[PDB]
Amino acid sequence: RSSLRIRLFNFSLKLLTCLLYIVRVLLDDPALGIGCWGCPKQNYSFNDSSSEINWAPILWVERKMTLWAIQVIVAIISFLETMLLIYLSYKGNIWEQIFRVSFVLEMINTLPFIITIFWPPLR
Questions:
Q1: Signal sequence span per UniProt?
Q2: Exposed, middle or buried, 14 (CB in 10 Å: 0-12/13-18/19+)?
């Protein structure tokens, strides 16, 4: 029954982290200024005339320190629990875990939250 508790924890964690993403996107305004992090923060407007698409709003989203710190812990424990359960269940076959499309999405969603610690401007 402990494994059921672990699975429930995983599912509740995933739901809570997408809820934190939606609360992040709800409390943030683009008109204030968008930048990488810290000092460089500057405004953008979109015009239908020029077909050039300015990507700066896409890569960089304004985020407060508290929300980032909360999300990083969730992502770290998420990856740790997922790979702990993967190591718990080998079935005599470590392969084919890459092509199962459940770990690629997880890992791509999770590693950047740890990488952000390496580069403070990348938060």
A1: none
A2: middle
Residue 13's contacts (CB-CB under 8 Å, 6 or more residues apart) are 74, 77, 78, 81
What approach was used to elucidate this structure?
A: cryo-EM
Map tokens 């999300």 to a residue: 71
Alpha carbon distance 123, 113 (integer Å)? 8
CB 63 within 8 A of CB 27: no
Q: Which residue has the tokens 């999405």?
A: 105
**Closest by alpha carbon to 55, among 65, 64, 67, 46?**
46
Can you tell me whether residue 119 is helix, strand or coil?
Answer: coil
**Resolution of the structure, angstroms:** 2.9
Cβ(34)–Cβ(60) below 8 Å: yes
104, amino acid identity: V
CA–CA gap between residue 19 and residue 60 (Å, rounded) = 20
